[PDB]
Design a protein around this ligand. Structure first.
Ligand SMILES: CCOC(=O)/C=C/c1ccc(O)c(OC)c1
Ligand SMILES: CCOC(=O)/C=C/c1ccc(O)c(OC)c1
Lengths: 256, 256
């Protein structure tokens, strides 16, 4: 009475890519098979490509025969660049080189974007710039609030005059670029995101203490083909018990 | 009978600066003195920092005791980076590192921007992001048309589907990045430039056949404190006779 139950199948690769003289470091996960859809997974502000959330997303996508790549943004994790030089704009430039890496790959069928938080802002504006290429987008707690906070001169507790932004501000151990804050103020987030008319899923925790729920709702009102999933009680980063519910909504939207 | 006519006084330095792991190469010109105003001079699309126009502007500013720096943008002249990776966005990032270099210099009093054509677009966007820092701006045939052309699918004769832009398009023997064109299409040129309320002088040739002078008129309408100088018969580049008129209006506006 022997049983055998397959739970893991495929390949995992450490990838490096160049953007303007910076090395970006990523992990590629593929299922077995010559052709597969491929998701680009994008982390949040001060996070990295190997959060529990993004690992579990790559794992459950692979179970559904969907490949994934997840890169450290410039100034984060193992990728090059000073944290203080990172902006939402140069993270969009990182994501574009990753999209070109994937679009050029002979194994790939359709390209999906998955962005958590600031990674969700990046994903939404990349999709707006490549709506001909991106087939599905998942936004998790997309952090469009970073624009309103930069305009109000209050970024998660760090205060500054929004009309005389310093060169850099102290931020929880780190140095946040004046340029991050000046570009955040004028980011055409919703203006660019609305060019993407293909399917979008927006996943938000009811208990998100970092980004107000209003931001996710505005994405839902601006997208032609959106669904909005409010996960009861979930936190900002979908941690512990809330990880599984974000992963299940992601995998179920992207699966063949 | 003795005559003495001074025709050159100051210091010229070759500068290099880093932006995201790219070296940018520039020429710095100063007059004699411990404290001076400093103009950042910004070249156009496929040009470099040593066009006749920009050398003569640096020369005439130094005679009026105004220092200047002129850098090759990424993908141009002697600077790092492939032409095909250049966007308007990453030239604004180049210009921000130049602004930081100049703003950090103990000799520099007030900072002026001077931008020709695409350089004018860059200068206008940087001034909008740093309206608290930039004291004067001169735009010479600012090429805000690059947005409308990208949306039309016709960039100086290079044609493409504006909703399915290729990875790169052949462009006068070089390769122009798809990302240049997709970001050109959504650039909030006038919306960002508007935030600059200090003095601006806009210098346009009535016979510009590369950028419609209407784009310079639009800047004049958008700015709080602008003057418009339409140079009868002058071409896009301000070649020959037209160079002295462009130089003279620049030096007159910035002089102490
Ligand atoms: C992308 C990971 O981002 C988050 O987890 C939260 C984002 C966030 C929210 C408000 C802000 O003012 C902000 O400015 C830097 C960022
Ligand atoms: C900045 C130097 O730029 C020029 O001399 C002219 C620029 C120009 C005009 C129309 C365009 O569609 C364009 O697309 C790249 C560029």
């Amino acid at each position: 009475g022997t049983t055998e139950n397959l739970y893991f199948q495929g390949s995992m690769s450490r990838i490096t890519i160049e953007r303007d003289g910076l090395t970006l470091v990523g992990d590629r996960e593929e299922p077995f098979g010559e052709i597969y859809d491929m998701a680009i997974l994008m982390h949040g502000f001060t996070a990295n490509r190997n959060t529990p959330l993004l690992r579990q997303i790559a794992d459950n996508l692979r179970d559904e025969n969907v490949a994934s790549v997840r890169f450290d943004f410039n100034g984060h994790g193992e990728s090059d660049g000073a944290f203080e030089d990172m902006t939402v704009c140069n993270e969009i430039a990182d994501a574009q080189k990753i999209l070109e890496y994937v679009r050029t790959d002979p194994h790939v069928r359709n390209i999906f974007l998955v962005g958590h938080a600031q990674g969700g802002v990046v994903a939404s504006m990349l999709a707006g710039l490549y709506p001909d290429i991106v087939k599905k987008v998942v936004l998790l707690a997309p952090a469009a609030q970073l624009k309103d906070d930069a305009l109000n001169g209050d970024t998660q507790g760090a205060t500054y005059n929004p009309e005389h932004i310093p060169a850099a501000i102290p931020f929880h151990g780190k140095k946040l670029g004046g340029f991050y804050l000046r570009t955040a103020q004028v980011l055409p987030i919703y203006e660019i995101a609305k060019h993407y008319t293909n399917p979008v899923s927006i996943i938000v925790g009811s208990n998100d203490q970092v980004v107000a729920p209003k931001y996710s709702k505005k994405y839902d009102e601006v997208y032609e083909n959106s669904e909005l999933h409010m996960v009861p009680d979930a936190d900002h980063s979908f941690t512990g018990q809330y990880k599984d519910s974000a992963v299940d909504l992601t995998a179920e939207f992207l699966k063949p």
